[PDB]
């Protein structure tokens, strides 16, 4: 169609995409200059600004849907972008319950367009997501190792040290921490040893294994390179 064709020409024109990118970056700078020690009228204006950008982004996404339908949803990056604008719109129509301010969090989440609406970012991140599957096997193995070691620890160190190992969750968290080598002896292992002396035999092999496996993971990346 004539009107259909004109709208499509505008949508694919590099000018429109660059316009959205710069608009997004402007919105990003706008939201960025947000300091919570505010409680001023500034906050109100920030919210006002949010409204306009989302409306414009709603406009933009609507146009995208008009040009191509099933092709637009088929492309993950495009659908992702549609979802982001959608969540922003939802926070736009209503607000979260007093107890927990999740919806203002979705309003802030909106910022991922800076990668989805940008094609170079799209290509680089697509390279990375194409890399991950080759190592998802090791990811899953390491996740299973985490699960097993976490069960074991939580059942051991649950009585005296519930803050770190009271349940499987704190145990998963603390084991990931130990994997990172962040205050693993001074803040964790040694306090544990004070009551359970031979707990060292637990973590030192663990360190080995996981750290070693992570080397393999990195080696797998090197495998994908050389």
């Amino acid at each position: 169609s004539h009107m259909y064709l004109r709208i499509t020409n505008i949508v694919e024109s590099s000018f429109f995409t660059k316009f959205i990118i710069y608009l997004i970056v402007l919105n990003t700078l706008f939201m960025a200059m947000e300091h919570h020690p505010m409680t001023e009228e500034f906050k109100n204006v920030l919210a006002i600004g949010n409204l306009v950008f989302t409306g414009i982004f709603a406009i933009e996404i609507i146009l995208r849907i008009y040009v191509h339908r099933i092709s637009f949803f088929k492309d993950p990056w495009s659908l992702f972008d549609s979802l982001i604008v959608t969540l922003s719109l939802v926070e736009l129509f209503l607000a979260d319950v007093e107890g927990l301010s999740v919806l203002r969090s979705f309003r802030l989440l909106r910022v991922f367009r800076l990668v989805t609406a940008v094609p170079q970012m799209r290509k680089i991140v697509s390279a990375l997501i194409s890399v991950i599957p080759g190592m998802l096997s090791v990811i899953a193995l390491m996740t299973l190792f985490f699960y097993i070691f976490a069960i074991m620890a939580t059942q051991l160190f649950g009585e005296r040290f519930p803050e770190w190992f009271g349940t499987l969750g704190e145990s998963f968290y603390t084991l990931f921490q130990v994997m990172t080598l962040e205050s693993w002896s001074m803040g964790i292992v040694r306090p544990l040893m004070e009551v359970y002396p031979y707990a060292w035999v637990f973590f030192i092999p663990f360190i080995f294994v996981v750290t070693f496996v992570m080397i393999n993971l990195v080696v797998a990346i090197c495998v994908d390179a050389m």
């Binding site: 109100n44 919210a47 006002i48 129509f93 209503l94 607000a95 979260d96 319950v97 007093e98």
Partner: peptide
């Protein structure tokens, strides 16, 4: 009366029942 959905609201012009003021009247997730 009261400020309906999406109408401007402030300390003196409150939102109608079931809504909350966030510069404009929003719904309290039903």
């Amino acid at each position: 009366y009261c400020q309906k959905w999406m109408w401007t609201c402030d300390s003196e012009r409150k939102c109608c029942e079931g809504m909350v003021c966030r510069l404009w009247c929003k719904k309290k997730l039903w």
